[PDB]
Each structure stands twice: as C-alpha cells, then as structure tokens.
A and B are shown apart, each in its own frame.
Chain A
Amino acid sequence: GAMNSSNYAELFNNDIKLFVDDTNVYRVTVHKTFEGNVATKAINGCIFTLNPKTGHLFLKIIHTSVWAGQKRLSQLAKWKTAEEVSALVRSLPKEEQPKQIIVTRKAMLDPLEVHMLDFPNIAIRPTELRLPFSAAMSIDKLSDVVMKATEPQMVLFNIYDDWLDRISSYTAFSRLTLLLRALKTNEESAKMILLSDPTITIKSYHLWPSFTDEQWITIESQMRDLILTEYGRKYNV
C-alpha cells in the first residue's frame, strides 16, 4: 500500500528499498523565438534513486540527447525513468535488489510496474508523503555533475556523508529531508546557512559540511526557523 506518516519507520528496517524521484528527469528553460513564439530548450536531468536506510544514491544522469527527435517528452520522461530504474535493478546482484520501490509521484506507477514485469516480487508503491527530493539539484556537487555530463552516466554518492557513523538512519533521513525542505522553500537562505562559516568545509568525498554534533544542532534549528518563516510569508499567518 501507500507510504504515509503511519508506516514511516518501515523505511529503516532491513528490507531493501528504494525511493525513486523523477521530478528532475526532464528539465527545460522557456524562451521566446525570433518570431516571438515560445520554445523550450532542454538541459541535462537526473533520476534520484535513494536507499533511505544506507544513504546510497544512484544518480542516473539524463543527457539532453535522449530527447532528440522525440514527441510528448514529459510523458516519455516517466517511461525513460522506469526503463533506467529497471536496468539498475537488473544490474544489481540478487541479494542487493530491492524488495520495494517507492515512487515519489503516482504517475510513475504504471510505467515502473510495466518495466518491472520481470520482477513480480518487487512491490511498486506510491507515497502520500510530500518528500522534497526535487531540491536535489540545489546540492552543488549533484547539480555540477549533472550539468557537466556529455553522455548518459550513473554517478554514485552517499547522500548522508559519514553521518551514519554517529546517528541512526531515521535521524539521518530526517536531517536530509529537513535540509532539502529548506533548500526547496528558500534556496538562497538555506545555502547561506550551510556555508556562512568558512572554517567548516566539505570533504572532497562528501556533499555537506563537516559539522560537529553541536553544529548540526544549530544548523537544524536554523533550517527549522527558515521553514516556518517562509510559511507565514506564503499564507500570511
């Protein structure tokens, strides 16, 4: 069934599972043509496939060449996502293949289901959670590798850096989603908060700064505050 607040801790048990987010697979800019009509220009995109328990991220870069000469691109994007996720499962050894795949948008269900017919025992699930994975392109290193790519490419990351050495999956995912929520709601302020202190650096093999435990506490409170303020502004509360 669907994933929601009730069955949230299922994400951190030992059943292998992956989130798939397709929001950044098909990305365009909109511009005017010489005759004044509107046209789109595609830029490189990515599939965000994440194991919430281990932090392993499978960033499948979607090169603009994929779209060449194709119609109905936003619909094709869903099938290309499903094609690529299926290939990823096929590429993994049996004991690493997931038992569930949770799609962040319900429109992916039919395309993934069809692409996964060879895997009847892998459950394809929607979610009612409003996960902020669209903001993954606000993480500088991820956006950089996507935009520089010249061909299709899979890049692997651990989206939790080394946090699991010191905190649980549950807490790691809560931090990640808080950081991404903040970045989605006001990217400029979120990014200001993470980097204001020049003495806290990002390891070459990491995505986020090397905060101490106490600094993570201050950061998380700053991100909380950021998010509440923006809410009042949005709704005038």
Chain B
Amino acid sequence: MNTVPFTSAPIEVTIGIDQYSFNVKENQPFHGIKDIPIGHVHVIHFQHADNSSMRYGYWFDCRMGNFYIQYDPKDGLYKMMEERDGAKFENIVHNFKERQMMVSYPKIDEDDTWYNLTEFVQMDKIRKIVRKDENQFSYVDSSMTTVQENELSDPAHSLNYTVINFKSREAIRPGHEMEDFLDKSYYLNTVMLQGIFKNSSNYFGELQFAFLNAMFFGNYGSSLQWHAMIELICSSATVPKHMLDKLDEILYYQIKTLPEQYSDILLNERVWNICLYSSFQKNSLHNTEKIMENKYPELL
C-alpha cells in the first residue's frame, strides 16, 4: 500500500482518486490519500469549488517514485511533485498518518472495477501520449487537445494519441479502395496492431486511457479517440477472438462506470448503434450490448 501526501489544502476543491472523490473545504487539514493499491496506474484529479471548468489531474504509479501534492498560489492549482529524499518522505507520510489527517483509498474487496478499467494501461505508454519527460507522472485536463485535433496549436500540451482516420491513404490500400473501406481488417491488423501498437494490449491500453480521460476531465478529443478505436475493431470483419471477448469486457466496465447523467455527450450515437447493431461484430459484444440497452435505451 502506498501514500500520496498533500502539503495543505488552501482552496476549496473536490478531489478524486480513481473513481472515488471527496469534498475538501478551504484550509481544511487534509494531508493525503493512503492505502493506494500498488500494482496499477492511478489518477488524482481536482475541480475547484469556484471554477466548475477545467477539471485537471495527474496519472501516476507509486512504484515509480514518491509523489505528493502541493498547492501553488501563483499558478493557482494543485501540483504533483516527486520527493527524491526517501527518508524525508517516509517521515512526512508517517507523521500525517499518526495525526490521522489522511483519507484511505476506499476499495471494496469484492470490487475489480479499477483493475477492469485500467487492465492494459501502463504508465510508460501514458508518458508517450502526454510527453513531459522531466516528470514521472502525467498531467491532463479538460481543455488539452489531441495531435489530430491540432492538424485540423501548442504541441508541448498535446495528447499524442495514435491518429486513426478511415479516409486516409494509411487506411486504404490502392486498388482495395472499396474492400478496405467497408472491411477495415487490413487497417486494424496490419497497419495498427502489427505495425504501430505491436500487440493488442497496447491498443487496449490507449483505448482505456482515452476513455478515462474523457470520463474524468471531459476531454472531448479523448472521447473522439475512444470511439474511433472501438469503431475500427467493430468495422473489421476479421478480428482475433481473444480481442473481441476482451473488448466486450472492457466496454462493459466503461459503460458500467460512466455517470448516468453524462451519457449524452460522452456516447456517440452513431458509433454505438453501428457497432452494436450494424457492424461485423454486432453479435460479439453481448455483455456491452445488454448493459447499453438496460441503462441507455434512449441513445439507441
């Protein structure tokens, strides 16, 4: 079990850790989150009471260092930082616990939700999508745009998702125009899986990371990226059976975890109706189909 201490909480803010969240009042004695499960990535995020705009937060993995939060009154936001002095860090963490000023990561033992949402997400791949190599953790927020969004302005602050575009030379082999556009198997399996992602787990990891950013920060380009990667599979006639089964699990837990009130902006009617009911794989997402119908029959 690991700990992320906070120096203080100067401004009223809603703090989230993964799918949990806590309201913290201005200059309340809050000093961190403990009992964070080792073995997965995590995200700690913020929404100020005074600005229900710009949700922001940090992806991290405690195996990669000792991380803490500190409010910066110049930039006006909670910043994540690394403490390199291991002893100085254990000392802060031990005293804050002794004083009991830390909230416990509230995991129900039956619950595999977080594992299911992050199964293929690996901190290393996150740091290639959010490039800032002087830190071991990654900042994301509501307004960051993707590399594809930028092509159609500041690159240091971009989400470098893999660019997918169904009407591109990359996606369409000369002479297989009609074939490749109606059956994207070539694009999925040769170009994307064997070519760029190398294996299905890296692909799923980017898919899941894009979902999480859309869900936690309302990052619109991440929603676009998640939908595109779903559509590329469902629009391929030939998909490894292990990918389809895992995809149904992946999407099930994503749909399960989404707040019911956000289904309007976060779910793309066209893609979902095409994937569940028109696509080659209409019959391969039984769990995802069953939860979609019982929870969001309107969208369909």
Interface set of A (CB-CB < 8 Å, partner B): 76, 79, 82-83, 110-111, 113-115, 117-118
| Chain B: minimal CB distance from A73 (Å) | 13
Least Cβ distance of B176 to chain A in Å?
A: 10
Check if B172 sits within 8 Å of A110, measured CB to CB. no
Tell me whether B167 and A110 are in contact (CB under 8 A).
yes
Contact with A along B75-110 (1 / 0, CB 8 A): 000000000000000000000000000000000000
Can you give 22 contacting A-B residue pairs, CB < 8 Å? A76-B178, A79-B177, A79-B178, A82-B177, A83-B177, A110-B167, A110-B181, A111-B177, A111-B178, A111-B181, A113-B167, A114-B167, A114-B172, A114-B177, A114-B178, A114-B181, A115-B177, A117-B167, A117-B168, A117-B169, A117-B172, A118-B169
Q: Which of B154-192 contact A (CB under 8 A)?
A: 167-169, 172, 177-178, 181
Bound-state CA distance A114–B177 (Å) is 7
Docked pose: A83 CA to B172 CA in angstroms? 14
By a CB distance below 8 angstroms, the chain B residues around A114 are: 167, 172, 177-178, 181
Query: How far, in angstroms, from A83 to B169 measured CA to CA in the complex?
Result: 15
* Interface range for B: under 10
Q: How far is the CB of B182 from chain A (nearest CB, A)?
A: 8
For residue B179, which residue of chain A has the nearest CB? A79
How far does the Cβ of A199 sit from chain B's closest Cβ, in whole Å? 51
Q: How far is the CA of A234 from the CA of B37 in the complex (A)?
A: 74
Chain A: minimal CB distance from B189 (Å): 19
A82 to chain B: which residues have CB within 8 Å?
177
Query: Closest CB of chain B to A119's CB: distance in Å?
Result: 11
Which of chain B's residues has its CB closest to A82's CB? B177
- A interface SS class: helix
Residues of chain A lying within 8 A (CB to CB) of residue B177: 79, 82-83, 111, 114-115
Residue of B nearest to A72 (CB): B182
Closest to B175 in A: A83
Bound Cα distance from A159 to B174, whole angstroms: 33
Q: Which residues of A contact B167 (CB under 8 A)?
A: 110, 113-114, 117
- Bound together, the chains give a CA A115 to CA B179 distance in angstroms of 12
7 closest A-B pairs by CB = A79-B178, A114-B177, A114-B181, A117-B169, A115-B177, A113-B167, A114-B172
Set of chain A residues within 8 Å of B181, measured between Cβ atoms: 110-111, 114
Whole-angstrom distance between the Cβ of A84 and the nearest chain B Cβ: 12
Interface centre among A76, A82, A117, A118 (most CB of B within 10 A): A117
Q: Which residues of A have CB within 8 Å of B169?
A: 117-118
State the CA gap A168–B226 with chains docked (Å). 53
Cα(A79)–Cα(B167), bound, Å: 14
Neighbouring A residues of B168 by C-beta, 8 Å: 117
Name the distance in Å between A171's Cβ and chain B's nearest Cβ.
38
Q: For the complex, give the distance between the alpha carbons of A111 and B168 in Å.
A: 12
- Residues in chain B near residue A111, CB distance under 8 A: 177-178, 181
Task: Chain A residues near B172: list those with CB within 8 A.
Answer: 114, 117
Among A76, A83, A110, A114, find the residue whose CB has the most chain B CB atoms closer than 10 A. A114
- Assembled-state Cα–Cα distance A117/B177 (Å): 10
Give the residue name and chain of the A residue nearest to B174 (CB): A118
Closest to B170 in A: A117
Shortest distance between the CB of B263 and any CB in chain A (Å): 28
Give the residues in chain B near A113, CB-CB below 8 Å.
167
Distance of A10 Cα from B167 Cα, bound (Å)? 27
The chain B residue with its CB closest to the CB of A83 is B177
Closest Cβ of chain B: how far from A81's Cβ, in Å?
Answer: 11
Q: Once bound together, how far apart are the Cα atoms of A113 and B167, in whole Å?
A: 8
Bound complex: CA A115 to CA B169 (Å): 10
B168's closest neighbor in chain A, by CB? A117
18 other A-B residue contacts (CB within 8 Å) besides A79-B177, A82-B177, A114-B172: A76-B178, A79-B178, A83-B177, A110-B167, A110-B181, A111-B177, A111-B178, A111-B181, A113-B167, A114-B167, A114-B177, A114-B181, A115-B177, A117-B167, A117-B168, A117-B169, A117-B172, A118-B169
Instruction: Kindly state the separation between the CA atoms of A114 and B175 in the bound complex, as whole angstroms.
Output: 11
Q: Cα distance A79–B177 when bound, in Å?
A: 8
In the assembled complex, the Cα of A113 lies from the Cα of B168 at a distance in Å of 10
Chain B neighbourhood of A83, CB < 8 A:
177
B151 to chain A, nearest CB (A): 13
Task: Report chain B residues within 8 Å CB of A110.
Answer: 167, 181
| A189 → chain B closest CB, angstroms | 41
- Interface residues in B175-212 by Cβ distance below 8 A to A read 177-178, 181
Chain B residues with Cβ below 8 Å from A117 are 167-169, 172
